[PDB]
Design an enzyme around this catalytic site. Structure first.
Site, PDB file in Angstrom:
ATOM      1  N   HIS A  89       0.858  -1.164   0.000  1.00  0.00           N
ATOM      2  CA  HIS A  89       0.000   0.000   0.000  1.00  0.00           C
ATOM      3  C   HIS A  89       0.906   1.230   0.000  1.00  0.00           C
ATOM      4  CE1 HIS A  89       0.467  -1.216   4.260  1.00  0.00           C
ATOM      5  NE2 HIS A  89       0.987  -0.005   4.279  1.00  0.00           N
ATOM      6  N   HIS A 132       5.699   5.956  -1.402  1.00  0.00           N
ATOM      7  CA  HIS A 132       6.373   4.739  -1.852  1.00  0.00           C
ATOM      8  C   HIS A 132       5.491   3.551  -1.520  1.00  0.00           C
ATOM      9  CE1 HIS A 132       7.333   4.968   2.443  1.00  0.00           C
ATOM     10  NE2 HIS A 132       7.484   3.653   2.423  1.00  0.00           N
TER      11      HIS A 132
END
Length: 182
Positions: A42, A127
């Site tokens: 995620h 990220h």
């Protein structure tokens, strides 16, 4: 014991067409690197380590308000990198970029603070974490990606600790209901 709290975080889910090439990149891991499962991948926007359950409705209202006027975000995979920047890497990740994503994360973090709810964030650098380690391992070669996806909403997750690792449960989703042309 004190009143129980939840470990919560706001993140973008990563769809199957993106977790699959990321998992293919993880085949290069060796040594003490521990790959993140695709179900665990995620893009975190804020991590809230100890939320009293009575505050969850405020967090849901905040998620709805911040997403109401944004269109679905177009998220691009970029190159890989490590945390910390310092010599021994503990995390391997792929950078993600999207118009609006930093602004959303910063507004979210500000709103959470305004509510008097605690966060445990570093400077925002969007990220997807791919692997973690403690101790030595062969460093991976630089990789870059060209895939992208359209994120329809922001998710509020709860983290629950298990022997295999943390498990994430969706608490609420907040749809991006806006547009970038109107």
């Amino acid at each position: 014991h004190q009143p129980s709290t939840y470990r919560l975080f706001y993140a973008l889910r990563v769809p199957a067409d993106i977790t699959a090439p990321l998992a293919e990149a993880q085949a290069k891991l060796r040594g003490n690197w521990r790959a993140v499962r695709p179900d665990q991948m995620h893009v975190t926007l804020s991590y809230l380590p100890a939320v009293p359950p009575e505050r969850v409705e405020d967090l849901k209202r905040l998620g709805t308000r911040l997403t109401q006027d944004l269109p679905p975000l177009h998220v691009n995979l970029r190159g890989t990198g490590y945390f910390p920047n310092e010599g021994s890497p503990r995390v391997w990740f792929v950078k993600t970029e999207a118009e609006g994503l930093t602004e959303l994360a910063e507004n979210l973090r500000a709103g959470i603070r305004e509510l008097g709810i605690g966060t445990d964030d570093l400077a925002f650098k969007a990220h997807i974490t791919l692997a973690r380690k403690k101790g030595p391992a062969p460093r991976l070669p630089p990789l870059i990606f060209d895939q992208s996806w359209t994120a329809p909403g922001l998710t509020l997750y709860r983290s629950i600790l298990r022997k295999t690792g943390p498990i994430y449960e969706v608490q609420s989703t907040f749809r991006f209901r806006g547009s970038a042309s109107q």
